[PDB]
Amino acid sequence: KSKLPKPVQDLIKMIFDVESMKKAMVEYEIDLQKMPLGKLSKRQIQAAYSILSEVQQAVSQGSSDSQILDLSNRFYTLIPHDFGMKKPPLLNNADSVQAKAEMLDNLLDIEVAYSLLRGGSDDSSKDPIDVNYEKLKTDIKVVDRDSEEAEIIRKYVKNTHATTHNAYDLEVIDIFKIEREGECQRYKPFKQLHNRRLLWHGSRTTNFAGILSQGLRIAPPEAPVTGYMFGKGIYFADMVSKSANYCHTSQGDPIGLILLGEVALGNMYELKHASHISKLPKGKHSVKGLGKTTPDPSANISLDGVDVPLGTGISSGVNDTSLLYNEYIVYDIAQVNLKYLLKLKFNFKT
Ligand SMILES: C[C@]1(c2nc3cccc(C(N)=O)c3[nH]2)CCCN1
């Protein structure tokens, strides 16, 4: 039997749950009879991204519905969808491309989780929780609820829940301090960079085995750059609720996971509207999508020499922006050092 703390054991059980992976796939309209969890491969997902890029080229070139039909059909051939003997809906716009790009990002992490579960050794004398913990190559510790780091984290959660995201409230269940093997070494060129911030990253529970084993990643070269507001980078928020929305929790699944990462932002390229970029302008280290609301800058605190924007939301003074809240994007995976993982209970008021 495992000697790991019970919250860590529960975390391991949640992220390696095969039934949750199947549920995420069903939620995406994937046909599990034609494409089961065991049949998903990087190769297949990459080919589907490539086809999605062919679809975005046709939609931006102003091709007709009759013209896009074969391209749309091609995507469904690669990623079978649950439509029986009926015709699938046509993928003929930016919204459908974005929705499918997001789905493939999820399938990529699910494939990683399933590969870990299948690519190791079998020893019934060992607790499978300990076995699965070892596959993450991540030191996971429970943060003491009475510690200063827990107090700062709780304040960050308490103060940055947006009024527009009030259909639920958040209860912090557990706070974990995480250390991905080799990440400290990888982050070394950015460890003293100016404008290092502690930011939120929300994701579906089914993506966490991938995130902990591989770190936060950028969509592959095959992925459509127009499938993401600021292109192919790693996205963070300074508002807990903005990132919590990306956990995709519900009344039937109200427990989610959120990350706190130290992000080396450096010289920020400030944008108010979509810019589908792959690379940054010279001398820029990140993109800051300017929100109408920002955490109060006077309330900014330092945790282990990193800025924590835990102030309550105030007007940024930014006019005519597509964003209600800030978002930060890095285009080099080495600019992220994951620090904490929170298990949240979503209390839906609706
Ligand atoms: C829509 C998209 C995304 N935009 C975000 C902005 C702020 C935070 C997050 C997050 N996950 O915490 C975001 N995720 C684009 C790339 C992945 N999904």
Author numbering: 662 to 1011
From the paper:
Poly(ADP-ribose) polymerase 1 (PARP-1) is a highly abundant, chromatin-associated protein that is a key early responder to genomic stress in eukaryotes. Upon sensing DNA damage, particularly single-strand breaks (SSBs) that are the commonest form of lesion, it becomes strongly activated, catalysing addition of poly(ADP-ribose) (PAR) to nearby proteins, including itself, and thereby signalling for assembly of downstream DNA repair factors. A key component in transmission of the allosteric signal is the HD subdomain of CAT, which alone bridges between the assembled DNA-binding domains and the active site in the ART subdomain of CAT.
The most noticeable characteristic of veliparib relative to the other inhibitors studied here is its small size; when bound, no part of the veliparib molecule comes close to any part of the HD. Despite this, veliparib has a high affinity, not much below those of talazoparib and olaparib, implying that the more limited number of interactions it makes with protein are individually strong. In contrast, for veliparib there is a small difference in the opposite direction, consistent with the possibility that destabilisation of the HD subdomain in the veliparib complex by DNA binding has a slightly higher energetic cost than it does in the free protein. The SPR data is also relevant to another outstanding question, namely how it is that binding of veliparib causes mild stabilization of the HD subdomain, and thus leads to allosteric effects in the opposite sense to those caused by EB-47 (60); as confirmed by our SPR results, prior inhibitor binding causes slightly weaker binding of PARP-1 to DNA damage sites in the case of veliparib, but substantially stronger binding in the case of EB-47. The sizes of such effects range from those in the veliparib complex, which shows only negligible CSPs in parts of the HD distant from the inhibitor, through those for the olaparib complex, which shows appreciable effects only in helix F (that may in part be due to ring current effects), to those for the talazoparib and EB-47 complexes that show more widely distributed CSPs in the HD subdomain, particularly in helices C, D and F.
